[PDB]
Amino acid sequence: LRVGNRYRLGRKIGSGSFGDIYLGTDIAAGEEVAIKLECVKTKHPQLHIESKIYKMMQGGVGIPTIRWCGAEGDYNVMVMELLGPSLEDLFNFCSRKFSLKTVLLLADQMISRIEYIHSKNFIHRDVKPDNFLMGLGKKGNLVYIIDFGLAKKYRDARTHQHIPYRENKNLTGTARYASINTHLGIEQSRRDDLESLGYVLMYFNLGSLPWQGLKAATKRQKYERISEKKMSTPIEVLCKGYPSEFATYLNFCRSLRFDDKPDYSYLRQLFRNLFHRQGFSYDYVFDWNM
Numbered sequence: 001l002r003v004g005n006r007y008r009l010g011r012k013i014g015s016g017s018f019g020d021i022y023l024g025t026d027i028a029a030g031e032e033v034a035i036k037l038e039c040v041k042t043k044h045p046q047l048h049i050e051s052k053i054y055k056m057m058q059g060g061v062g063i064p065t066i067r068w069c070g071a072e073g074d075y076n077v078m079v080m081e082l083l084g085p086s087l088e089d090l091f092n093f094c095s096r097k098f099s100l101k102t103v104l105l106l107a108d109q110m111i112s113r114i115e116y117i118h119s120k121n122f123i124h125r126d127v128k129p130d131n132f133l134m135g136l137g138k139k140g141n142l143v144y145i146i147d148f149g150l151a152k153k154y155r156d157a158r159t160h161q162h163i164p165y166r167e168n169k170n171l172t173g174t175a176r177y178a179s180i181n182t183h184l185g186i187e188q189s190r191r192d193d194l195e196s197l198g199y200v201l202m203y204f205n206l207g208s209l210p211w212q213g214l215k216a217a218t219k220r221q222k223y224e225r226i227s228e229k230k231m232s233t234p235i236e237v238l239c240k241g242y243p244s245e246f247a248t249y250l251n252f253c254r255s256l257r258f259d260d261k262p263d264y265s266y267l268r269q270l271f272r273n274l275f276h277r278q279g280f281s282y283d284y285v286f287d288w289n290m
């Protein structure tokens, strides 16, 4: 089962919004890798675009290394540093219950990953548990961020001139975690990644969100029902029963102006001071490590 003379494939290990991911062997390097394949018959080619964004992100903490991109047989190919399980996988393994300590350990790192992407001029646009993966081996305690398939530039690399406040008619990424600005058809900016992470954190605390599992016939009526339930659930109701920092977080992100540089440090501190007041330490002992 070959991809040229370069890689052998072992098995399929995931399928994201486009293409498929295989665990494979990098023959030259003698190491396992994650190989993403997009069929060259695609009339909506995305992999090359995603590969360039991953190239631009290289070097950051918790960004997987891109090994090789090209075309082999019937596929466009992107080969990446192989990572461990996703937070969605780990959360389901933990029966959808994380300890406050694990939620805060994860928050600290997730905020930094998002910050890093923003430092490189992009909005992620698909912040969700499936898009954060733990490292392998000695890097088992480091949270990585993946899926740059929806990532879009928000400022000029030279000047830092922010994109104009403008409409965006698509609900692009996952509706469960989308920002209210996004539901209102406004272009996503740095605030919106952070608000989405707020919903991810509350999802980790609750096991599910109140707008999750609403049935509808059209895919646009499902989005409309999520949008309504999200807009009708105040942050204070959503976060009832958990430390106030979760609400403060969400309120801070909803209060950001479109072009505001978020105070990521403040947001990490909110959760860090909570974490220390609870008597935890940043030892990277997660719930799945016990």
Ligand SMILES: Nc1ncnc2c1ncn2[C@@H]1O[C@H](COP(=O)(O)OP(=O)(O)O)[C@@H](O)[C@H]1O
Pocket (backbone or CB within 6 Å): 013, 014, 015, 016, 017, 018, 019, 021, 034, 036, 050, 064, 080, 081, 082, 083, 084, 085, 086, 130, 131, 133, 146, 147, 148, 149
């Ligand atoms: N580098 C990787 N190592 C291990 N698993 C991965 C890796 N990249 C993706 N996966 C798995 O495949 C799923 C889909 O990946 P995808 O959304 O297409 O990621 P990307 O676009 O970054 O390749 C992910 O949720 C994850 O479980």
